[PDB]
Each structure stands twice: as structure tokens, then as C-alpha cells.
């Protein structure tokens, strides 16, 4: 009946201060946001638009698996022509309660 609560990975009580290391999967983001991508070329003489659910940098291409980076397949682009890309971020209507995103709290114990 209740969502999965936050999870403490590590703690440190250092000079009267608490430093908490939370396991952060960012599910609240992953489930609400998505990208809408617009591609224009000359073949393709009309604006092609697609949606992105996963922006994960896994592979197994000769690229990278690092952080501070996002990966996604862009259909409609041809290497021989000039193409213009334009991205937008859109929210998921299912995440809203009384027109408010991420509307609620969560319950945890530090002991």
C-alpha cells in the first residue's frame, strides 16, 4: 500500500554533525520525466519527433559507462546530410496529485 522508503548506505557522526550517504536510485525522477526529441534534415523534409524513457550509458559500444553523461539512440539522423536536433523534457501526468508533482513525504529511523 506504501512506496519503497529511502535507504541509508553509510553514516558518520563527526564533530556533532551527522553525514548520511543515501542509496539514491532517483526513481521519483526516472518515472516522471522523459525527453521529447525533434530532428530536422531534408529527406525528412517534415519534423521527425521521438521520445526517450531510458537515458542510460550501458553499451556494449566502443564508447563509455561513466557518470555526468546521458546516452540515447537518435533515429532519423543520416551521416551524409545536415541534421538539427532540439530536446525538451516532459513530465508524466500520473505523478501528479491535486496538480502537484512529488506531493508526499516518507518514513525512516536513525538508530
Amino acid at each position, epitope marked *: 500500500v506504501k512506496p519503497d522508503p529511502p535507504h541509508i548506505k553509510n553514516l558518520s557522526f563527526h564533530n556533532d554533525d551527522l553525514y548520511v550517504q543515501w542509496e539514491n536510485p532517483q526513481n521519483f525522477i526516472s*518515472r516522471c520525466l522523459f525527453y521529447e526529441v525533434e530532428v530536422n534534415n531534408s529527406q525528412t523534409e517534415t519534423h521527425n519527433v521521438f*521520445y526517450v524513457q531510458e537515458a*542510460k550509458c550501458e553499451n556494449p559500444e566502443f564508447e563509455r559507462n561513466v557518470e555526468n553523461t546521458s546516452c540515447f539512440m537518435v533515429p532519423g539522423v543520416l551521416p551524409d546530410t545536415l541534421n538539427t536536433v532540439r530536446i525538451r523534457v516532459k513530465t508524466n501526468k500520473l505523478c501528479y496529485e491535486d496538480d502537484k508533482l512529488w506531493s508526499n513525504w516518507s518514513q525512516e529511523m536513525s538508530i
Partner: antibody, heavy 119, light 105 residues
Framework: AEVQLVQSGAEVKKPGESLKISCKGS????????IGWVRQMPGKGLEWMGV????????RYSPSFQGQVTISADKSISTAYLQWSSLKASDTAMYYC???????????WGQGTLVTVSS | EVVLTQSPGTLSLSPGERATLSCRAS???????LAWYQQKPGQAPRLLIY???SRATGIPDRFSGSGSGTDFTLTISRLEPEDFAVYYC?????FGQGTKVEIKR
């Protein structure tokens, strides 16, 4: 592998009995997408039941379906569930589970589970 | 909530003809949230178009979605015998009542 959602077998239950249908997804990141439940009564159209985001089990229900049924998930076995505590004859329908990206469309469907409730 | 009305309820056409199904939304909706589905007798529905105009994987070129705000259209250019089924438009918790596309004889 290709995306596939596989649902549990046909059920013939008496009114007043509990029931839990399962939906097992494969060929994709189970927790990356939501799972929806759609009802299709004999000879009728489609009805959006409710949805779950397996990642954090964030569940939403259509007003017609709230408090009538329970949507749950088991990350570990790539499974989504729909359940009634006390079935009525009026629950007789085909039930489909489907995969849904954040835009709300259902891109892959389960084969359906036929539910028959009678005295 | 949002209510989608499909027109007509039954479309009677010959194979090879042009099919235009319409989906009217009660309120103006974002084109990214509208999708069309096909459902053959005794089969699970299949998604054809999402985001009002984007074809799903493997959906042939004959199916094209267009529309904006309140008036959305599904177009089957040339009708192949497989194309005679029930088509539904949807935005989140809201589904259309369906359009059966049948063989006119």
C-alpha cells in the same frame, strides 16, 4: 532477447473468493518502465485499471477501480500483480497487463488472462 | 476527466481503400500523450502510434497518425485484409470507445 510480458493462466472462481493474476516481463529493465492493467469485459471495449512503477512500487488507480483491486510488484522476479480480495460476478473479463513508458502509451502487452466469476 | 469520442463507430470500406478514424478529445491534450491501438478478434491489442504521430516498432508505413489539441486522426492509406479490426485511441487513464473497420461488400 525481445520484450515479452507473460500472464498467468485462466481462472474460474466463485463470487466472494480472492484472486491474484501475475504478469512476468522479460527482455527489458523491469524497473525502468511502468506496468499497467487493462480490463476487457465480454464483448466490450478497453478500461484502464491502474499502473505501477516497479522501481519504487508507486501505484496509481483509475477512480472506477480504486479500492476494488490491488496492484503490486516483485522487482526480484520481474513480476507485476493484480488482485481482488472478494470477487463479484461483474469481474468476469479478460485482463491484460502492459508495459508503459512515461508518456502513458502501452507498447508491449501480455497475452491476457481470462477471468470467469460465477456461483 | 478527459473524454475521447471516436467517429465513426463502424467504418465500412473495400480492401485497398483509405481509412480515416477520428479521435475528439473533450479538452486540449498534449500530442505526446495520444496513442492508437489495433485489436483483432480474439487477440491482445497492439500499439500502432504513440505521441499522436510516431509509429511503434514494426508498424507498417500504411498507418499514420496526425492531429493536435482536440482533433486526432488515424489513417490507413491502403487497406490490407489484416487491417480489418477495432481501433482505439488513448491518453493515460482514458480510452476511446473504439472504431470497428469492416469489409464492405
Amino acid at each position: 532477447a525481445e520484450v515479452q510480458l507473460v500472464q498467468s493462466g485462466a481462472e474460474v472462481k466463485k463470487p466472494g473468493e480472492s484472486l491474484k493474476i501475475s504478469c512476468k516481463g522479460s527482455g527489458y529493465s523491469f524497473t525502468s518502465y511502468w506496468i499497467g492493467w487493462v480490463r476487457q469485459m465480454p464483448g466490450k471495449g478497453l478500461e484502464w485499471m491502474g499502473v505501477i512503477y516497479p522501481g519504487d512500487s508507486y501505484t496509481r488507480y483509475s477512480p472506477s477501480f480504486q479500492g476494488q483491486v490491488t496492484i503490486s510488484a516483485d522487482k526480484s522476479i520481474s513480476t507485476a500483480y493484480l488482485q481482488w480480495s472478494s470477487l463479484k460476478a461483474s469481474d468476469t473479463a479478460m485482463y491484460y497487463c502492459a508495459r508503459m513508458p512515461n508518456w502513458g502509451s502501452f507498447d508491449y502487452w501480455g497475452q491476457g488472462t481470462l477471468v470467469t466469476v460465477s456461483s | 476527466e478527459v473524454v475521447l469520442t471516436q467517429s465513426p463507430g463502424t467504418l465500412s470500406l473495400s480492401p485497398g481503400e483509405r481509412a480515416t478514424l477520428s479521435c475528439r478529445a473533450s479538452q486540449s491534450i498534449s500530442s505526446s500523450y495520444l496513442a492508437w491501438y489495433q485489436q483483432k478478434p480474439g487477440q491482445a491489442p497492439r500499439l500502432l502510434i504513440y505521441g499522436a504521430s510516431s509509429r511503434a516498432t514494426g508498424i507498417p508505413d500504411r498507418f499514420s497518425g496526425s492531429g493536435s489539441g482536440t482533433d486526432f486522426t488515424l489513417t490507413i492509406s491502403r487497406l490490407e485484409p489484416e487491417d480489418f479490426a477495432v481501433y482505439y485511441c488513448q491518453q493515460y487513464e482514458t480510452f476511446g470507445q473504439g472504431t470497428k473497420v469492416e469489409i464492405k461488400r
